[PDB]
Design a protein around this ligand. Structure first.
Ligand SMILES: *[C@@H](CC(=O)OCC)[C@H](C[C@@H]1CCNC1=O)NC(=O)[C@H](Cc1ccccc1)NC(=O)[C@H](CC(=O)OC(C)(C)C)NC(=O)OCc1ccccc1
Ligand SMILES: *[C@@H](CC(=O)OCC)[C@H](C[C@@H]1CCNC1=O)NC(=O)[C@H](Cc1ccccc1)NC(=O)[C@H](CC(=O)OC(C)(C)C)NC(=O)OCc1ccccc1
Lengths: 180, 180
């Protein structure tokens, strides 16, 4: 009920559709000129953001202390406009919930809102052959074109959707401390 | 973009969650006290509508001239409140579109909005062993609990989701002339 409304306001104000040479993704802007994509989107020095080319000034593929893949890329956009700062809405650690929304917004799947149910701390996953950490698992989404989707509960952004197999979907935890 | 917004306003104002002895469904109220469910929901003399028992005064399983199943049940509710009249938003015939939204709202899948893509006039289908007519086909939804979902484009209600197999989903066309 409310999760949906929180999710619409977030996507309206902070999401965009991105095309890289590797596909189409939902992208979430975080603050200033910093946004987040799944690592596998591999953004280059320019991306198409809502149909417009936008320069990327820097791109950081996140890894943990020991260098384990976190499957997220932080990108700094070469644009004058700043994002509305949503760092306050970010989870401080991996979050488990009984109900969450996955929000996806691309030209192929516009304005898609999926109630994904129980979200659990899956932890380590061999995702597309790559050892990955801080995975959140949920049942029931799981097609190409949905990566970058934003996983949310009321008033919190939990993760960014990165992978899946069968009826299972996986988000990279989107943690407050990643930003700065 | 707009299809989503039209879809939210419709669901907000005219949809409800229904439980019959046969499951949980999205239900759309049409006008007066008349609402629509998939035929297979088989509503009895009482249904649970948004958590409250509500009497059903009459239930008509629709069939065409020759008695072919249309897979829709019209129900008249024993309640004082009238539905907002949306007969004007109903398609007059089977509609094919390149993009449509499927909106599903139950306790298990709350506030679910799915862009389903190309919607074509499939026509006759052997659905769950029953010969059925006036089917609209689209790719990509297709789980238990989603029947009754409302298929829409901007400013039009096209159908009610009734069945599926694999990545294919099927709506019964929701035609203006069924109401009266
Ligand atoms: C989003 C990005 C995308 O579409 O890229 C291709 C254009 C996509 C979403 C998943 C596809 C299936 N379900 C989804 O939700 N992500 C990926 O494809 C992701 C890319 C990736 C991520 C990390 C490192 C490398 C690559 N890969 C996966 O999700 C893979 C999918 C896969 O290879 O399997 C099939 C394509 C389904 C055959 N999933 C995976 O490796 O899971 C292993 C596994 C097995 C059993 C249980 C859990 C997980
Ligand atoms: C919604 C109602 C429901 O959940 O009832 C059970 C509690 C549900 C939605 C579909 C399930 C799979 N995908 C869906 O979108 N509807 C049905 O289950 C529907 C009930 C029905 C409708 C009409 C007459 C009798 C019964 N049945 C179907 O969709 C059947 C599903 C089925 O039996 O197959 C599996 C369960 C998937 C194994 N679909 C069907 O008969 O399709 C035949 C077909 C084959 C190849 C191409 C197209 C269609």
């Amino acid at each position: 009920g409310p999760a949906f409304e929180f999710a619409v306001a977030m996507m309206k104000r902070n999401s965009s559709t991105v095309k890289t040479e590797y596909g189409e993704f939902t992208m979430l802007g975080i603050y200033d000129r910093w946004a987040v994509l799944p690592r596998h989107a591999k953004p280059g020095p320019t991306i198409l953001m809502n149909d417009q080319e936008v320069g990327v000034l820097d791109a950081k593929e996140l890894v943990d202390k020991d260098g384990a893949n976190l499957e997220l890329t932080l990108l700094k956009l070469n644009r004058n406009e700043k994002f509305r700062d949503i760092r306050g809405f970010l989870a401080k650690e991996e979050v488990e919930v009984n109900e969450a929304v996955l929000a996806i917004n691309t030209s192929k799947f516009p304005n898609m809102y999926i109630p994904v149910g129980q979200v659990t701390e899956y932890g380590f996953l061999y995702l597309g052959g790559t050892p990955t950490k801080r995975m959140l698992m949920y049942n029931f989404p799981t097609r190409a074109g949905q990566c970058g989707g934003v996983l949310m509960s009321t008033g919190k952004v939990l993760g960014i959707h990165v992978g899946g197999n069968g009826h299972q979907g996986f988000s990279a935890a989107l943690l407050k401390h990643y930003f700065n």
